Amino acid sequence: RTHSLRYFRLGVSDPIHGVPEFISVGYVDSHPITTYDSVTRQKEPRAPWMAENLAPDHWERYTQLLRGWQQMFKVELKRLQRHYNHSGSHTYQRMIGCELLEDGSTTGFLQYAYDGQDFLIFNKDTLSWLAVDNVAHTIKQAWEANQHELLYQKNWLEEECIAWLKRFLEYGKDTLQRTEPPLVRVNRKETFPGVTALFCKAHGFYPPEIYMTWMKNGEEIEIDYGDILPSGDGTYQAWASIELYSCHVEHSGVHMVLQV
Amino acid sequence: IQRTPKIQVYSRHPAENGKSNFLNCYVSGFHPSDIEVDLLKNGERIEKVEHSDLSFSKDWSFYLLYYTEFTPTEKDEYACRVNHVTLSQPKIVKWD
Numbered sequence A: 001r002t003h004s005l006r007y008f009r010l011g012v013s014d015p016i017h018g019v020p021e022f023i024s025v026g027y028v029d030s031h032p033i034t035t036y037d038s039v040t041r042q043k044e045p046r047a048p049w050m051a052e053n054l055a056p057d058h059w060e061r062y063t064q065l066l067r068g069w070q071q072m073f074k075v076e077l078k079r080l081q082r083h084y085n086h087s088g089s090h091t092y093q094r095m096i097g098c099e100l101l102e103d104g105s106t107t108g109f110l111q112y113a114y115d116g117q118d119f120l121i122f123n124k125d126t127l128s129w130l131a132v133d134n135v136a137h138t139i140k141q142a143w144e145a146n147q148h149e150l151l152y153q154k155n156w157l158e159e160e161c162i163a164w165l166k167r168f169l170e171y172g173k174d175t176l177q178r179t180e181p182p183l184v185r186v187n188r189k190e191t192f193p194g195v196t197a198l199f200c201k202a203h204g205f206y207p208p209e210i211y212m213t214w215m216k217n218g219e220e221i222e223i224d225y226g227d228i229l230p231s232g233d234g235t236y237q238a239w240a241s242i243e244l245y246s247c248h249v250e251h252s253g254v255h256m257v258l259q260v
Numbered sequence B: 001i002q003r004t005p006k007i008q009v010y011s012r013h014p015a016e017n018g019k020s021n022f023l024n025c026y027v028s029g030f031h032p033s034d035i036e037v038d039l040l041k042n043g044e045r046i047e048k049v050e051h052s053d054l055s056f057s058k059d060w061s062f063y064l065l066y067y068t069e070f071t072p073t074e075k076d077e078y079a080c081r082v083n084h085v086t087l088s089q090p091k092i093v094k095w096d
């Protein structure tokens, strides 16, 4: 099964009461694993399998790194605001991560956003930065001049990130490698006079990755889709609607057909 | 560019009156991060309300889950009240 490891950083300049000027959260797939903010100034686990398998020295060392990353983000957001001639509260974001695909191949990404919009995107295959505008192009020229840091980043995305993900996958296997099949039902109902609505609803499934589609006489085809929503108990819910019909649902190597 | 939150109000399990359940409020796709969320029973704030920490999407927006244990009735009205910089006043989204 495909799995991913991601770490986000959020920097907020001049925050209003009750908003940290820095937050950093890690995820394995859709599960929070680590947290840090400028109010607690502590790196903490956000999953019991993370707390149980990592020695206290982990959180002590990452508390210090995160305190430094916080200072770095503060200063980069100031240089960005000065480049754009911006005052007031602005946001700066980072997302780093990797994916272990089901065929065993891997991916890696490192991106930056300014005010919730794309800003800089790393290309680890050419060791270059993709800049969205003149400001980002100024930043990219500085960052691209440090060759060893580009090589470090490639190594981190391709080796270090995959090695951590494999470790965390083993720590949280009873959660992450489990499968809870969906509960799927089809519901028919005349809505507007002469109009019949077909609803295909799925719930109680884990992982959230599911494929839902309506077919007509065994072949394809105006479908409405519902978002994959968390049910609050670790499982998810979703739907698809239309107006011989069959709902097709694919989840964790099992195909399901619900004929009308 | 500010993005207004998507507010979705649904029960953990297919609802039935008289049977214990969980009412969820999923607030997503919002930017910036500051948001206020409350669950309401017949217009009043529910005290025992649990929630997830602020979460991060790949498109740079944020999401959160607010939930509470509840036993739905035919007479009781439930909603999710949200406030964000994109909203002039707090938005009350009813459980349908």
Ligand SMILES: CC(=O)/C=N/c1c(NC[C@H](O)[C@H](O)[C@H](O)CO)[nH]c(=O)[nH]c1=O
Residues within 6 Å of the ligand: A007, A008, A009, A024, A025, A026, A034, A035, A036, A043, A058, A062, A066, A096, A153, A156
């Ligand atoms: C293991 C842990 O507890 C938390 N680690 C964090 C982290 N480490 C990944 C890279 O080591 C790092 O991005 C580096 O800058 C890549 O070059 N990155 C974060 O952003 N926030 C974190 O909380």
